[PDB]
Amino acid sequence: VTPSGGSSKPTTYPALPNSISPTSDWINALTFTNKNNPQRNQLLLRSL
Amino acid sequence: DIQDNVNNDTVEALISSYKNTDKLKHVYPYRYSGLYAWQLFNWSNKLTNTPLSANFVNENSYAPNSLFAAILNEDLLTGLSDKIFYGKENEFAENEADRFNQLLSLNPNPNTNWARYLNVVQRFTTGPNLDSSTFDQFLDFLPWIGNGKPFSNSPSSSTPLPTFSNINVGVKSMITQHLNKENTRWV
Amino acid sequence: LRSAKSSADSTGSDTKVNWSNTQSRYLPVPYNYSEGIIDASVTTFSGLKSIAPDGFANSIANFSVGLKAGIDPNPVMSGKKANYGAVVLTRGGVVRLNFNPGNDSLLSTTDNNIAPISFSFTPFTAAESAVDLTTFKEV
Amino acid sequence: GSVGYDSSSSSSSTKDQALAWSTTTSLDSKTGYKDLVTNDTGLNGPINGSFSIQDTFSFVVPYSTTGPIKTAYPVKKDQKSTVKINSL
C-alpha cells in the first residue's frame, strides 16, 4: 500500500504459532486453536 | 499463515471506505482466514447473555450429542395457556426487498402469546463444573469401559501419550514470540 | 442532608458536602436494542440502526425512572434489623440497590475482585422491553 | 455528561470544539472489578480510537517499554495561558 509520505511495507505476519493440529489448545490465538466448548461436551458424551 | 495483513495503512483500500446503504452492501477484497474454533465463534448458534440474540444458525443434529438436565418453572408450566399463537413476527420475508432490510427482532402482536412460553427453564447443566483445558483434563481422567484404562495413559523412555489434554505432549516453550509479543510476562 | 442544607445556606463562598454512602456503575444501553453492527466502514452514531422497543427512537442514551424503596417482609434472624432495598427501571433491565440495615450502608463484601455488591442488573425479556418507559406514571 | 469546550476567539486548533475522550479500560488490564475501574487508561486525556494489532481490530488501547504510558488534556502547552475552556 502507498499512504502519505511514500513509506511502504509488505502486508504479512511478523511471527506465528507453533502448531495447527486438531489437538491444539492455544490461549492467545483463536485463529489457530481447534478445541471448543461444544466439542468438549460432544466428546464427554461420546467418550462415556 | 497467508491472511492479508490489515497493518494500519492497509485498511483504507480493503474496508475503511466501503459504506453500506438501505439498498447497497459490499464483498471485501480481503483474504479472511482461521481454524475450527474461530469458525464456530463467528457462525455457530452460540448462547449469549440475552435471549433471542443468535442471528446465525447452521443445521440441526442427526442424534443427541449433549448431556442435559434442567430446573423448570412448575408454576409457569401450570399457568401457560393451552393454545400457542404465533404471528407475522415469526414469518420469513415475503420478498427479497424485505430480506435486504430484514428486522432482527420484534415485539409480540396484540393477539399473539408465543413470548410467554420462552421462560419455562430456570437453570440447566451439561457436564462437570470445570473451565478451559481443565475440562479436557477430566476427559483424560475417566476410564474407557472396554478395558478399564484412563485416556491420560500415565499409570503405565518411549512411553505413550494422552489423547484429550495437551499436558506433557511435545515440549514446553515460552509464548513470548507469538502475535503481539506483549502482556505474556504478567497477564 | 444537614451538610447539604449548610452548603445551600453558606454565606459568600461555596461550602461543600461529602455523601460517603454512594457508588457509580458503567450501565450501557443493551446492544440488542440495535441492528447490523460491523465486526469479524466501521459503524458510528450517524449510521447506527435502532430497533429500540422501549418507546425511544435512539438506541445509545440510557434512561432510568421510578426509583422506589421497600422493607422485605421476610423475617431476618433476631437481633438483626429488617432488610430493605430499592429498585429502578433502566433501558433493558431492572436494577436492585442493596443496603445493610445494620449501619444503613451499601452492602459491600471483602473481595474487590467481585464488583460492588450494592448493585445488580436483571435484563428485561421481550415483554418488559416492549413497554414504553416514557409513559411511566407511578410506582 | 459534562466536559470542557474551547469558546476561544481569533488560531486555536480546537476552537468551537468540545474536549471529550473515551475512558474505556485497555485490553491488557488485569481483570477483576477494582483493577478495571482503577485502570490508569484515558485518565488525564485521549488514548482510544482504532488499533489493528497483528490482524485483530480493537477500539481500546491494547496495553496500559521505555517507561509507563502518559495521558494529557488536549490543550497545547503554548496556548495554555491564552485559551478559554468553559463547561457544558
Grid cell, residue D10, equals 481569533
Question: Does residue C116 sit at the D interface (CB-CB below 8 Å)?
Answer: yes
Contacts of B187 in chain D (CB under 8 A): 28, 30
CA D44 from centroid of its chain's CA atoms: 6
Distances (CA, A) of D75 to B24, C37, D11, D17, D49: 41, 33, 13, 11, 19
C68 within 8 A of C103, measured Cβ to Cβ: no
CA trace torsion D69, D73, D75, D78 (10° rounding): -50
CA trace torsion A19, A20, A21, A24 (10° rounding): 70
3-class secondary structure, C86? strand
Contacts of C35 in chain B (CB under 8 A): 103-104
A27 within 8 A of B131, measured Cβ to Cβ: no
**Beta C105-106 vs C49-50: how paired, if at all?**
unpaired
Distances (CA, A) of B144 to A24, A44, C13: 23, 12, 80
What DSSP assignment string belongs to C11-53?
SSS-------S------PPPGGGEE---------TTTPEE---
The alpha carbons of chain C give a radius of gyration, in whole angstroms, of 20
Contacts by residues B21-24 (CB-CB < 8 Å, ≥ 24 positions apart): B22/B101, B23/B100
Dihedral (CA of B164, B165, B170, B176) sign: positive
Least Cα separation, residue C84 to chain B (angstroms):
25
Grid cell, residue B52, equals 433471542
Partnered with residue C122 across adjacent β-strands are C94
CB contact under 8 A, B36 and A22: yes
Question: Shortest CB distance from A29 goes to which of B1, B142, B179?
Answer: B179
- Give the neighbours of chain C: at least 3 Cβ pairs within 8 Å: B, D
Dihedral (CA of B120, B122, B126, B131) sign: positive
Question: Does residue C115 sit at the D interface (CB-CB below 8 Å)?
Answer: yes
Angle between helices B134-141 and A37-47 (to 10 degrees): 10
Question: Does residue D49 sit at the B interface (CB-CB below 8 Å)?
Answer: no
d(CA D63, CA D47) in angstroms, rounded, equals 10
d(CA D8, CA D2) in angstroms, rounded, equals 18
B10 within 8 A of B31, measured Cβ to Cβ: no
d(CA C95, CA C123) in angstroms, rounded, equals 9
Distances (CA, A) of B7 to A14, B2, B3, D52: 10, 14, 11, 6
Phi, psi for B62 (deg, rounded to 5) = -70, -50
A32 within 8 A of A24, measured Cβ to Cβ: yes
d(CA B160, CA B156) in angstroms, rounded, equals 9
Phi-psi region at B139: left, alpha or beta (left = phi > 0; alpha = psi -120 to 50):
alpha
Specify the experimental method.
cryo-EM
Contacts by residues D17-25 (CB-CB < 8 Å, ≥ 24 positions apart): D18/D88, D19/D73, D19/D74, D19/D75, D19/D85, D21/D45, D21/D46, D21/D47, D21/D48, D21/D74, D22/D46, D22/D47, D22/D48, D22/D49, D22/D59, D22/D60, D23/D48, D24/D48, D24/D59, D24/D60, D25/D60, D25/D64
Dihedral (CA of B102, C60, C120, C97) sign: negative
Least Cα separation, residue D13 to chain B (angstroms):
25
d(CA D19, CA D84) in angstroms, rounded, equals 12
* Burial annotation C85-123 (CB, 10 A radius, 16+ → b, else e): bebebbbbbebebbbeeeeeebeeeeeeeebbebbeeee
d(CA C27, CA C29) in angstroms, rounded, equals 7
d(CA A15, CA C78) in angstroms, rounded, equals 65
In sequence order, the 6+-apart residues with CB closer than 8 A to the CB of C128 are none
Residues in chain C: 139
B135 within 8 A of A40, measured Cβ to Cβ: yes
Phi, psi for D72 (deg, rounded to 5) = -140, 150
Contacts of A17 in chain B (CB under 8 A): 178-179
CB contact under 8 A, D33 and C115: yes
d(CA B127, CA B121) in angstroms, rounded, equals 18
In sequence order, the 6+-apart residues with CB closer than 8 A to the CB of D78 are none
d(CA A7, CA B10) in angstroms, rounded, equals 12
Query: Could you tell me which of D52, D35, D28 has the C-alpha nearest to residue B183?
Result: D28
Specify the resolution in Å.
11.0
Task: Match 425512572 to its residue by C-alpha cell.
Answer: C65
